[PDB]
mmCIF file of C-alpha atoms and ligand atoms in Angstrom:
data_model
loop_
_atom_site.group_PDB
_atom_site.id
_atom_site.type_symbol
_atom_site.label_atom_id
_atom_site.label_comp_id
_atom_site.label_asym_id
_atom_site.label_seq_id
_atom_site.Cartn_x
_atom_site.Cartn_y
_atom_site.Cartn_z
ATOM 1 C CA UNK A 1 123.909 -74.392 2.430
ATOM 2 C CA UNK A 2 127.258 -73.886 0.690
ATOM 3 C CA UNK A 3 129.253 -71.373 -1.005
ATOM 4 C CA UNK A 4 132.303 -72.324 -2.721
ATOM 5 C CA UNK A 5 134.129 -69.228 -4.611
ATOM 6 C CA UNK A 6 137.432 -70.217 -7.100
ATOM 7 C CA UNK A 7 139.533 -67.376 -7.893
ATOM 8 C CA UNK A 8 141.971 -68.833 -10.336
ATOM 9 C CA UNK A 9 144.867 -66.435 -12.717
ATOM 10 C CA UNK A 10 144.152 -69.498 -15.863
ATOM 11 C CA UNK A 11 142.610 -67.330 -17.990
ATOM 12 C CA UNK A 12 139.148 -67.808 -18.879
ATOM 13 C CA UNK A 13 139.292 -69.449 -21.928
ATOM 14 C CA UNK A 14 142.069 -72.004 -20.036
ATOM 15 C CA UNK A 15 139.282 -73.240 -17.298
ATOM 16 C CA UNK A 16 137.634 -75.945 -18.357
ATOM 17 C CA UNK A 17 133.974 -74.810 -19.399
ATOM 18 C CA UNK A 18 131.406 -75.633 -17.188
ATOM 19 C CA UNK A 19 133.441 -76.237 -14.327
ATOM 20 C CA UNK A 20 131.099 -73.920 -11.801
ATOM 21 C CA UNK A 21 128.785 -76.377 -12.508
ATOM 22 C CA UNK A 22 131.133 -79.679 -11.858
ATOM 23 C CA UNK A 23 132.210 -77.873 -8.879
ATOM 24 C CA UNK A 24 128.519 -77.445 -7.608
ATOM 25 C CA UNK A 25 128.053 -81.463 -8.221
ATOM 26 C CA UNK A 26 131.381 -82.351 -6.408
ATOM 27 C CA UNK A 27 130.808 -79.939 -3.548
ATOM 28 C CA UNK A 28 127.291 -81.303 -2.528
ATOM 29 C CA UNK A 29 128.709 -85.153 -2.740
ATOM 30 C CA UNK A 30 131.740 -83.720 -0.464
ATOM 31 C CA UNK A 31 130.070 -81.813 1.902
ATOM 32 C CA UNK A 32 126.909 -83.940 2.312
ATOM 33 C CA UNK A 33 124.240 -81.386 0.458
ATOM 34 C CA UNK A 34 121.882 -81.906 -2.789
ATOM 35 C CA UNK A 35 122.901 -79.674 -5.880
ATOM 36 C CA UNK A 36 120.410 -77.477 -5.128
ATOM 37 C CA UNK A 37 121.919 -75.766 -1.749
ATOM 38 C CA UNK A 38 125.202 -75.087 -3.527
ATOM 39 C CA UNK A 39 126.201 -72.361 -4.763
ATOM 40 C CA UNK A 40 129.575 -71.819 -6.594
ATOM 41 C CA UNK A 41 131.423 -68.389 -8.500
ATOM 42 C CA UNK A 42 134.982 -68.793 -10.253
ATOM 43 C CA UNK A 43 136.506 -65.893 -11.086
ATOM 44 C CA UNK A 44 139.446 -66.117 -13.774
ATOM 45 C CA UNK A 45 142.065 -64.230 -15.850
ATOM 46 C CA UNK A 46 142.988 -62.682 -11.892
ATOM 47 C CA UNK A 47 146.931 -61.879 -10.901
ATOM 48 C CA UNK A 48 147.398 -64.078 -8.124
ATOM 49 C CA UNK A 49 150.753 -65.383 -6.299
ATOM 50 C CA UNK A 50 149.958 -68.699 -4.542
ATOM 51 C CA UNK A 51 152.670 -69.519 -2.177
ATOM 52 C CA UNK A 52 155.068 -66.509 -3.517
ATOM 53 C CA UNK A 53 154.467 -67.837 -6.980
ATOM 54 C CA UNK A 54 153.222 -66.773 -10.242
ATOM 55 C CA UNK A 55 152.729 -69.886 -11.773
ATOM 56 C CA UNK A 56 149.160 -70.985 -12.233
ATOM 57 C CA UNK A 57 147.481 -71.606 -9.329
ATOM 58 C CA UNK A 58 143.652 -71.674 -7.765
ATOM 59 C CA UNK A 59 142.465 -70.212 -4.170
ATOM 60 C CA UNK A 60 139.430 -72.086 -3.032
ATOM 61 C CA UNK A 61 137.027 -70.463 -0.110
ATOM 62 C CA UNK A 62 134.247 -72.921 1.145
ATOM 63 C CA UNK A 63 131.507 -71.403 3.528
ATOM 64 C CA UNK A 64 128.845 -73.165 4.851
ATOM 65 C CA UNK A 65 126.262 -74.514 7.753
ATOM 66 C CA UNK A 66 127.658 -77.006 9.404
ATOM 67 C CA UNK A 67 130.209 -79.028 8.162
ATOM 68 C CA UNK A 68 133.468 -77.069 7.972
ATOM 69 C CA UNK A 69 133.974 -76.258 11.671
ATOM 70 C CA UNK A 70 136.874 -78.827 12.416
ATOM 71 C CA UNK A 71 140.015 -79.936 11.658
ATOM 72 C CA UNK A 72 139.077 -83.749 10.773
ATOM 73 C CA UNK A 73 135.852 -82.429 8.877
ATOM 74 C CA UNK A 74 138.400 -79.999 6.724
ATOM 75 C CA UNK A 75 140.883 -82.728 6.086
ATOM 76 C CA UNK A 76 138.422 -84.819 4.445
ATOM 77 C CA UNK A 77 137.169 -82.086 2.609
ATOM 78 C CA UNK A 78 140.195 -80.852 1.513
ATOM 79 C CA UNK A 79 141.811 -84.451 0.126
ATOM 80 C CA UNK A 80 138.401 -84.671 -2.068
ATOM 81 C CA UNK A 81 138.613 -81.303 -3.014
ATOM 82 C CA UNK A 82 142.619 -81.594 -4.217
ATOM 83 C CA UNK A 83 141.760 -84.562 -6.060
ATOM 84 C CA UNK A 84 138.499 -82.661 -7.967
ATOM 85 C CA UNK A 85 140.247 -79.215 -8.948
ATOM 86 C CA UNK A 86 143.408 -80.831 -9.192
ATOM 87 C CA UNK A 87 142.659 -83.134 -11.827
ATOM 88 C CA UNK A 88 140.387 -80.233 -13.561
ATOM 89 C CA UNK A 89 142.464 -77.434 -13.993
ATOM 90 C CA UNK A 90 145.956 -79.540 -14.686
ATOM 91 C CA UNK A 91 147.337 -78.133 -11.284
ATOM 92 C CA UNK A 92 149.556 -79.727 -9.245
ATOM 93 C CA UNK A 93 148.957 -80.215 -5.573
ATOM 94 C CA UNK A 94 151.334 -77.479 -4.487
ATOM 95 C CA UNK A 95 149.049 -74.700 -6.598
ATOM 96 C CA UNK A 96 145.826 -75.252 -4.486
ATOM 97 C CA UNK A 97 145.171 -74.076 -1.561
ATOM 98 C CA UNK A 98 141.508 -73.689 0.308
ATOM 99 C CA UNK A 99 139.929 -71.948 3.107
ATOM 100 C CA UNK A 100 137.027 -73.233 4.989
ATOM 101 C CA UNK A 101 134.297 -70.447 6.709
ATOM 102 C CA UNK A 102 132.009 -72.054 9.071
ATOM 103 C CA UNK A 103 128.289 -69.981 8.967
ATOM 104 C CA UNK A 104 125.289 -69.699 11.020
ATOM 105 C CA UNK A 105 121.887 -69.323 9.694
ATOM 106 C CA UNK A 106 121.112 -65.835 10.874
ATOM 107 C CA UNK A 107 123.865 -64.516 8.533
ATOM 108 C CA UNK A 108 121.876 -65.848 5.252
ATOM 109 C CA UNK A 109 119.802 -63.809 3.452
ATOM 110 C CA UNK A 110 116.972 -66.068 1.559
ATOM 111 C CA UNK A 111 114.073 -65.323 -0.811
ATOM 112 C CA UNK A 112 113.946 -61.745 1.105
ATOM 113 C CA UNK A 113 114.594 -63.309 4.844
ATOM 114 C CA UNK A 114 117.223 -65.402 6.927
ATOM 115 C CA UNK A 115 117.580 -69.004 6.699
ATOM 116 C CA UNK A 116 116.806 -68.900 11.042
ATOM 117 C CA UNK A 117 112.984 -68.282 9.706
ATOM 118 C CA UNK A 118 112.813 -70.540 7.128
ATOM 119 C CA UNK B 1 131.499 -48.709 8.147
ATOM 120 C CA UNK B 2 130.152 -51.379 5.286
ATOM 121 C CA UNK B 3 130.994 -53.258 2.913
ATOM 122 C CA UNK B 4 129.270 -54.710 0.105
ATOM 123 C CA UNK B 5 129.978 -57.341 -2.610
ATOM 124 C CA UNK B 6 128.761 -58.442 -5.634
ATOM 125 C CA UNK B 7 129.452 -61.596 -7.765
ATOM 126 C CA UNK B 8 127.346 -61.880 -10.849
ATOM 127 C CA UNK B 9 127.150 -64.055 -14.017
ATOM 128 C CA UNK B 10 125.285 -60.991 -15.879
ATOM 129 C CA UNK B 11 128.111 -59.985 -18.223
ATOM 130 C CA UNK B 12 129.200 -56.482 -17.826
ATOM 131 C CA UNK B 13 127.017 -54.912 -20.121
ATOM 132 C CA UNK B 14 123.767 -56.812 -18.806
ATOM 133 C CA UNK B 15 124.343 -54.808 -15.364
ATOM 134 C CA UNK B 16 122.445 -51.463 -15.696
ATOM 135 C CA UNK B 17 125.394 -48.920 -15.277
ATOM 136 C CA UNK B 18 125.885 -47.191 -12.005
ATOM 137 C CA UNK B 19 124.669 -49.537 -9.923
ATOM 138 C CA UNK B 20 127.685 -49.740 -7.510
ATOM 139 C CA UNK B 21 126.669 -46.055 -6.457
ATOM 140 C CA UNK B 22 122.630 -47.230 -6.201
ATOM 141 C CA UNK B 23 123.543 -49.854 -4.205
ATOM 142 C CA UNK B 24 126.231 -47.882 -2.197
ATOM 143 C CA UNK B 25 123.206 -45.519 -1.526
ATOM 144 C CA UNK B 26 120.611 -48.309 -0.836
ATOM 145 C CA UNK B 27 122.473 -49.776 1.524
ATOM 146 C CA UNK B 28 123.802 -46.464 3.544
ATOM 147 C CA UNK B 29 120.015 -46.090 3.628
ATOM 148 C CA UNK B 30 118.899 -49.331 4.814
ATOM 149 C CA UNK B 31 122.095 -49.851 7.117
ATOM 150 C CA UNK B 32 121.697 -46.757 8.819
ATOM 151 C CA UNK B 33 124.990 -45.081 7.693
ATOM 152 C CA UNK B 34 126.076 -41.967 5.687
ATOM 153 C CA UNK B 35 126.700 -42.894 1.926
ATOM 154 C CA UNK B 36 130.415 -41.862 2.993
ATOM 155 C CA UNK B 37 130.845 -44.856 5.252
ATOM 156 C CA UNK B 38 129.689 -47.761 3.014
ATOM 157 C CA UNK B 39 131.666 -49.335 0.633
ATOM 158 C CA UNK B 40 130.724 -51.328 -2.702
ATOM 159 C CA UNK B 41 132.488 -53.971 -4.861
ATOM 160 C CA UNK B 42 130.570 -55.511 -8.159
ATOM 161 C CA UNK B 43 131.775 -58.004 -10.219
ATOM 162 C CA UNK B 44 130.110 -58.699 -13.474
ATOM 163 C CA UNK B 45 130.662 -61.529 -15.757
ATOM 164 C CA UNK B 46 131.600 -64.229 -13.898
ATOM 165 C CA UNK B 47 130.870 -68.143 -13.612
ATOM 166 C CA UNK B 48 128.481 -68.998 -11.226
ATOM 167 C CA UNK B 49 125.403 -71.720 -9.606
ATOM 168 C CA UNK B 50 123.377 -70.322 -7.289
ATOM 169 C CA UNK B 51 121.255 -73.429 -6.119
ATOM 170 C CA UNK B 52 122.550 -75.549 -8.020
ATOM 171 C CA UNK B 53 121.607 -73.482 -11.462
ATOM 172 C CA UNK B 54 123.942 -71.358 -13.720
ATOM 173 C CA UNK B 55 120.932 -69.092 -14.657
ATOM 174 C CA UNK B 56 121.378 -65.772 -14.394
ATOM 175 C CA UNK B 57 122.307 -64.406 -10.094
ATOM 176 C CA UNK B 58 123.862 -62.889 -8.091
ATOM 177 C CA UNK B 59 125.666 -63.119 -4.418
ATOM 178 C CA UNK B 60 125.832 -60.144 -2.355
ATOM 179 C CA UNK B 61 127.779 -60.038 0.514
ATOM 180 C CA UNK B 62 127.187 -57.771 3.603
ATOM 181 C CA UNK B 63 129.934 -56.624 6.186
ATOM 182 C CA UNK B 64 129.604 -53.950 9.078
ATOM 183 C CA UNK B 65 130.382 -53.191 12.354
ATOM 184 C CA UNK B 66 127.492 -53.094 14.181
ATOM 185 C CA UNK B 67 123.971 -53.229 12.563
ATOM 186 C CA UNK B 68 124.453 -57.487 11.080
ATOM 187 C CA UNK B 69 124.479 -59.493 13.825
ATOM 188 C CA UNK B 70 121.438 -60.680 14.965
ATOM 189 C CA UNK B 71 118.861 -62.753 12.505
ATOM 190 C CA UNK B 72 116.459 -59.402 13.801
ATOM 191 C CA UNK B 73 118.162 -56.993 11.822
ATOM 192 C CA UNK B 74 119.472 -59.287 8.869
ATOM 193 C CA UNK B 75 115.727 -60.569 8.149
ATOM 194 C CA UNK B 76 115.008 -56.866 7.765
ATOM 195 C CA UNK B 77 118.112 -56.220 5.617
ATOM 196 C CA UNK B 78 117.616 -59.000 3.555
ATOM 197 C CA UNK B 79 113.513 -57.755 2.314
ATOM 198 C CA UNK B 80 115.239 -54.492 1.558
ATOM 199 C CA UNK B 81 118.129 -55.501 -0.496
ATOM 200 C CA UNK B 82 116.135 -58.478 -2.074
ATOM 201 C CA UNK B 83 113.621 -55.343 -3.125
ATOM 202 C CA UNK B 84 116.653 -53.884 -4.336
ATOM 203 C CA UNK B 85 118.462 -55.713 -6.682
ATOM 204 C CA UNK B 86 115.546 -58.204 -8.535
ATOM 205 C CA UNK B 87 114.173 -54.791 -9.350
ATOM 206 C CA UNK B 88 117.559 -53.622 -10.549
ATOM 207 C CA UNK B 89 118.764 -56.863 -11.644
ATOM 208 C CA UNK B 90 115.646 -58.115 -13.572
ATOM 209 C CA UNK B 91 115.977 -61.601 -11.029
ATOM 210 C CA UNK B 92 113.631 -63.597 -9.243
ATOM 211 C CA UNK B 93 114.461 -63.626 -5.403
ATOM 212 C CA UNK B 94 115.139 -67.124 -5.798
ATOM 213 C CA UNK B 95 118.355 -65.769 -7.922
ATOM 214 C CA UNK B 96 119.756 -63.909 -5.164
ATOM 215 C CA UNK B 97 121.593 -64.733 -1.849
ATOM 216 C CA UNK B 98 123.321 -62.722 0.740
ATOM 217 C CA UNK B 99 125.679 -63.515 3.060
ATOM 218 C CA UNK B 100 126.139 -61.259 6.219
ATOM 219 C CA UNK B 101 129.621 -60.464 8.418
ATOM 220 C CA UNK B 102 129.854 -58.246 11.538
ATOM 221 C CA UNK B 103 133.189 -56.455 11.617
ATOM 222 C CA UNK B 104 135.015 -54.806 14.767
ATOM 223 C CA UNK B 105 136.815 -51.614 14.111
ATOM 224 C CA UNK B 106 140.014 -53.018 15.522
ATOM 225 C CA UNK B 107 139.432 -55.117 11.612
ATOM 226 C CA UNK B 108 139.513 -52.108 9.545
ATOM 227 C CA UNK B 109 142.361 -50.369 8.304
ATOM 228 C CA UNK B 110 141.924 -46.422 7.152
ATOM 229 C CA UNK B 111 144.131 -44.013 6.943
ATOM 230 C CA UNK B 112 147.209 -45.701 7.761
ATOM 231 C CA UNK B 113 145.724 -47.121 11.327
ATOM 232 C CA UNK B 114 142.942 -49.015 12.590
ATOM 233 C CA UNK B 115 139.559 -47.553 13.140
ATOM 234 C CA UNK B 116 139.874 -48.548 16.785
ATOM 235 C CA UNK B 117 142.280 -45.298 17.112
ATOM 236 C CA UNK B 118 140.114 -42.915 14.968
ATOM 237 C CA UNK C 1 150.187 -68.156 6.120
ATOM 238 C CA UNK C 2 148.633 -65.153 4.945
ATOM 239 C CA UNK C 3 145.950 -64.352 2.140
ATOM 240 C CA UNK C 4 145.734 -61.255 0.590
ATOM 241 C CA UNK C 5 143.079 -60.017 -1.981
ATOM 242 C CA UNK C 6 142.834 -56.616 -3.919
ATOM 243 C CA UNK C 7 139.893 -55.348 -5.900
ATOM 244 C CA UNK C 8 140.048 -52.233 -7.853
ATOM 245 C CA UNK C 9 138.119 -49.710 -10.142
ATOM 246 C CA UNK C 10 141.503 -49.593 -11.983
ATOM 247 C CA UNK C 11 141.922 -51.186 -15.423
ATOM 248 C CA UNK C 12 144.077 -53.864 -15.583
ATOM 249 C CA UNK C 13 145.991 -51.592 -18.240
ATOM 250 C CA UNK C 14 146.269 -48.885 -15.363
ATOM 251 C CA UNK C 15 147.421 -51.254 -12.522
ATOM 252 C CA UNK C 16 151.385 -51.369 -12.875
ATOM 253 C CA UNK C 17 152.501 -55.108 -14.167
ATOM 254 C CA UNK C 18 153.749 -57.566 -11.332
ATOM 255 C CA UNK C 19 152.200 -55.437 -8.682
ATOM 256 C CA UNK C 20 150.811 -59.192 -7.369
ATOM 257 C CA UNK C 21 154.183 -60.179 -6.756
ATOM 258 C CA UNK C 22 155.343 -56.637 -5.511
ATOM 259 C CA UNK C 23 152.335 -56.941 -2.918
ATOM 260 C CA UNK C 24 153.331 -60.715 -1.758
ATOM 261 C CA UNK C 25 156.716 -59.340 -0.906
ATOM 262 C CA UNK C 26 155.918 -56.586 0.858
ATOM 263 C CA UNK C 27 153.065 -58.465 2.594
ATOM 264 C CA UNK C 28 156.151 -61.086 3.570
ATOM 265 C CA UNK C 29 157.938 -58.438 4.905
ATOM 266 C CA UNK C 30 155.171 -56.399 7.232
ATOM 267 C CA UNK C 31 153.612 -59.284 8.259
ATOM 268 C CA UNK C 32 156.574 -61.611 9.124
ATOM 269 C CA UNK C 33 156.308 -64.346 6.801
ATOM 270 C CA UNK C 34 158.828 -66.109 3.825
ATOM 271 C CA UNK C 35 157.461 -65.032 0.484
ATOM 272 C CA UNK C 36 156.887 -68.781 0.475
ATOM 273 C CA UNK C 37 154.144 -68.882 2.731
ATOM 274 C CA UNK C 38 152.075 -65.726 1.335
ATOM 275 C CA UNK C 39 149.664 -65.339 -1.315
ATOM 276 C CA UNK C 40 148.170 -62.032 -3.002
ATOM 277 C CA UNK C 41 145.110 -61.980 -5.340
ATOM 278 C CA UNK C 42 144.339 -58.908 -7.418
ATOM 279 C CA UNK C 43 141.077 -58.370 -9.328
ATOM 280 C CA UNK C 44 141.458 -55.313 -11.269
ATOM 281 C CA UNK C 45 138.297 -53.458 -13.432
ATOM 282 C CA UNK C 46 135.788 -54.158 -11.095
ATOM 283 C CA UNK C 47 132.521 -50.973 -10.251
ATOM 284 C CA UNK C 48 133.449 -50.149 -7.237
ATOM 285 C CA UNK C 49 132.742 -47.045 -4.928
ATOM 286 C CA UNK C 50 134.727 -46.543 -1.738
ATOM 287 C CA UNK C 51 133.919 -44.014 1.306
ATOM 288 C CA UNK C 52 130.695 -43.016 -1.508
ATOM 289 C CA UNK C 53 132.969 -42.292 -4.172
ATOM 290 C CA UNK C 54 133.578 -44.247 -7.532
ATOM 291 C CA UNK C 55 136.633 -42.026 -8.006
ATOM 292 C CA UNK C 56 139.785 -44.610 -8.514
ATOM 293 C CA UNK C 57 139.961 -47.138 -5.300
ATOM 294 C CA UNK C 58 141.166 -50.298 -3.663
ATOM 295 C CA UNK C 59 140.200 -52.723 -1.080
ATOM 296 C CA UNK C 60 142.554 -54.830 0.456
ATOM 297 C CA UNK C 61 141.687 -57.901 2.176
ATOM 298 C CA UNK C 62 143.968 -59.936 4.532
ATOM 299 C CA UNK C 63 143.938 -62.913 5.873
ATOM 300 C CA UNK C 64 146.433 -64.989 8.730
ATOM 301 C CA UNK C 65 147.082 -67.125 10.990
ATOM 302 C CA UNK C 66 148.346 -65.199 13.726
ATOM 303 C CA UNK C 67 149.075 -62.191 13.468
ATOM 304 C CA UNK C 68 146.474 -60.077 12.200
ATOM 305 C CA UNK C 69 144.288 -60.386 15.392
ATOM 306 C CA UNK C 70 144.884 -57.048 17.664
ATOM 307 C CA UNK C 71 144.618 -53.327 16.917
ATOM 308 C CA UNK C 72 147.820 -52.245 17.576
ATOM 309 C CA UNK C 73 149.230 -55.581 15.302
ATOM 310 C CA UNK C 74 146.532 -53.982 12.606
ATOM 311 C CA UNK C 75 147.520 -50.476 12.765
ATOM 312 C CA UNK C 76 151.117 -51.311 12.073
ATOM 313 C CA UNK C 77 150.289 -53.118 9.694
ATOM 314 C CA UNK C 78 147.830 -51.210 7.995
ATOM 315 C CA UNK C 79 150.771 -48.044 7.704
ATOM 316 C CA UNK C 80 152.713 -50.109 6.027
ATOM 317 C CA UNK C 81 150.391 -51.496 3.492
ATOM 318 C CA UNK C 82 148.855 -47.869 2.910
ATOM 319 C CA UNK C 83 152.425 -46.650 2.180
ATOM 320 C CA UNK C 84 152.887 -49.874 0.229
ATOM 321 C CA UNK C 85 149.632 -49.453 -2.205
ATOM 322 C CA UNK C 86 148.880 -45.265 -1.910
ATOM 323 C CA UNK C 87 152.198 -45.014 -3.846
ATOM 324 C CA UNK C 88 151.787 -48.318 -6.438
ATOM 325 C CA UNK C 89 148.517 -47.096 -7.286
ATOM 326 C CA UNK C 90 148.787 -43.659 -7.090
ATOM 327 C CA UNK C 91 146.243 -43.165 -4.770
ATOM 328 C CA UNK C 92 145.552 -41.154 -1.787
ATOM 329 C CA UNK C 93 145.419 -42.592 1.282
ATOM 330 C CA UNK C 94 141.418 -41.837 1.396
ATOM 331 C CA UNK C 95 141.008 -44.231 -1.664
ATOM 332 C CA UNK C 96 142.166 -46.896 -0.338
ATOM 333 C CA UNK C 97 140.752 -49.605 2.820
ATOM 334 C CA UNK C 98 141.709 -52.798 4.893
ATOM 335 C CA UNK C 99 140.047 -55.853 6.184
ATOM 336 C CA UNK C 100 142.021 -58.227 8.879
ATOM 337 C CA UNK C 101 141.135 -61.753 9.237
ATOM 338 C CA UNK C 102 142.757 -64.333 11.876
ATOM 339 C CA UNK C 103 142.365 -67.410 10.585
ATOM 340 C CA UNK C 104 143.260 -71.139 12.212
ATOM 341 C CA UNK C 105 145.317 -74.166 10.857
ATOM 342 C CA UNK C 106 141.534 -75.728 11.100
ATOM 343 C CA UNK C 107 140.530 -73.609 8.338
ATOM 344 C CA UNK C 108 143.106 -74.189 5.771
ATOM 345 C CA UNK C 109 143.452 -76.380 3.032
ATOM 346 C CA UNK C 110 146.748 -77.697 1.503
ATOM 347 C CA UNK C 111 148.050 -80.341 0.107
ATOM 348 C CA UNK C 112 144.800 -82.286 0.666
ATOM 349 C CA UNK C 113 144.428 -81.949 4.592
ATOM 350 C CA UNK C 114 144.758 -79.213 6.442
ATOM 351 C CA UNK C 115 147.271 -77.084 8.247
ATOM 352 C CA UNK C 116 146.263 -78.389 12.050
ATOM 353 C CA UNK C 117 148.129 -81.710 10.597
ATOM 354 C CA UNK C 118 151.305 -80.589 9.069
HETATM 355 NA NA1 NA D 201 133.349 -64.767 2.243
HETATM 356 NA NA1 NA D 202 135.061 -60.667 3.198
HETATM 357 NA NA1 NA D 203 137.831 -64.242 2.775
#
């Protein structure tokens, strides 16, 4: 499972509609996952300084099982996930940045549960 | 000491009102702590896919010291809080998913120190 | 690189203007970093109750590499950044909480790879 969150200070009606969907599709082709075990929140129209800067930028956090635990893993994450947000919210490469939050299954809570019992 | 947030895609005024202090007081009972040592954060009207769907959810994340780090005591978090917020919320438990985080005191800041020193 | 993320109970109208850029200098300065390498995310007008209360609040998140990993690093940090926000927000120091986070190159995203590789 995945969980991707965007904070981004574009305001709202500057982000591309529909993108937490997009994202969704382009996160489960990146890290390996079907649409349906993604899970995605963008939260616009913040105040945010990326890199001591104002300008319009995005902060990207990706959590999941698995997949994020190394530095190789990360860097080929990260190049398809520059190229994807990029591209969708007119940013240059400098106004990105993402972190990456390996998680185990006993810290997921699922249809009342943790993913270790299902 | 915990720590609770909550993304939604409910607008604001789809979220019954008040229910950062029911949840604050849910979760101080089913954490085991005082409502004055538990913290909540909810944040309506946002973008979001929760399994791949932009249908109504919500993501609630857990952090503590202590009492959420075994897949023992999240399973029986997670039938509590699931109990909790479809009923408040008005979701299926397939539109909810929590995400748990032990903390050490030495990570939280109060009162101008650490709580390793209080 | 540090991270730093605010959510508040204040209206955006009520949080003074600029205070993201205010808090990614001052977070340069306590935590040893060129305003270059720091970034500060506020999200203002959230629900939120803190220590119980839903009286005005903050919760400050940070993130590093480095340097946020000990108590005593944390409690010097943490009097700085309670002087820092108690007196931008006008709030007493009981209104007002900290998260650390160490983070590693591994887990950080820019320009496409990540920081292990540049
Ligand atoms: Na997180
Ligand atoms: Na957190
Ligand atoms: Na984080």
């Amino acid at each position: 499972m995945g969980f991707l969150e965007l904070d981004t200070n574009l305001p709202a009606n500057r982000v591309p509609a529909g993108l937490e969907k997009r994202l969704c599709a382009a996160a489960a082709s990146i890290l390996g996952k079907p649409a349906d075990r993604v899970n995605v929140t963008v939260r616009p129209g913040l105040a945010m300084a990326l890199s001591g800067s104002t300008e319009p930028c995005a902060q990207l956090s990706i959590s999941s099982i698995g997949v994020v635990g190394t530095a190789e893993d990360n860097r080929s994450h990260s190049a398809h996930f520059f190229e994807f947000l990029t591209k969708e919210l007119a940013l240059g490469q400098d106004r990105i940045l993402i972190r990456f939050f390996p998680l185990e299954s006993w810290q997921i809570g699922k249809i009342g549960t943790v993913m270790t019992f299902l």
